[PDB]
């Protein structure tokens, strides 16, 4: 399970903290709840404990896992459609699945591109976007600010960030 204090995403509302198991009864039986707090967004979220899996609540990136995430978003390289609608759809999907590995992956092909021969609109939304969810949970890994955490992606975004 999740324990109290476990560190979590539940896409795409962004990163939170898990505060503890609430039992209710109804009807005679009792369901179990996880409760998650947001800090970000001064919300909660409660998730029945059969349901993590189902609704994409999963354990946030580890502080030893954020160097590798960096070397990733660095070499990052994968097949993406030359049509542009079929594209959108592509980084839309991984974007919205919300997996950091998958998220970084992408951006590195994005950033390649830029750096290269510059992105159309949609693609820099996606990059931008990319980078915020990285960022964000990159940060509450390392108990630091996005402002700091956005510092440590300057070697593999080739530059420095904004």
């Given amino acids: 399970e999740f324990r109290p204090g476990d560190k979590v995403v539940l896409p795409p509302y962004g990163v939170g903290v898990v505060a503890g198991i609430a039992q209710r009864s109804v009807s005679g039986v009792s369901?179990?709840?996880?409760?998650?707090?947001?800090?970000?967004?001064?919300?909660?979220?409660?998730?029945?404990?059969?349901?993590?899996?189902?609704?994409?609540?999963?354990?946030?990136?580890?502080?030893?896992?954020?160097?590798?995430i960096l070397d990733l978003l660095k070499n990052g390289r994968m097949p993406l459609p030359k049509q542009w609608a079929a594209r959108h759809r592509k980084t839309s999907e991984i974007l919205a699945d919300g997996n950091?590995?998958?998220?970084?992956?992408?951006?590195?092909?994005?950033?390649a591109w830029e750096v290269e021969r510059g992105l159309p609109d949609l693609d820099r939304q996606a990059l931008r976007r990319a980078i915020h969810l990285l960022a964000e949970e990159v940060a509450q890994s390392l108990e630091i600010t996005v402002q700091?955490?956005?510092?440590?992606?300057?070697?593999?975004?080739g530059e420095e960030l904004n």
């Avoid at 404990?49 to 580890?62: D, I, Q």
């Avoid at 998958?102 to 950033?111: H, P, V």
């Fill in 31 to 68: 369901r179990a709840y996880y409760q998650v707090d947001f800090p970000g967004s001064r919300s909660k979220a409660y998730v029945p404990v059969e349901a993590p899996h189902s609704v994409g609540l999963r354990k946030a990136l580890a502080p030893e896992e954020v160097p590798v």
């Fill in 148 to 157: 700091e955490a956005k510092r440590l992606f300057e070697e593999a975004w």
């Fill in 100 to 111: 950091p590995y998958r998220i970084a992956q992408m951006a590195g092909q994005l950033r």
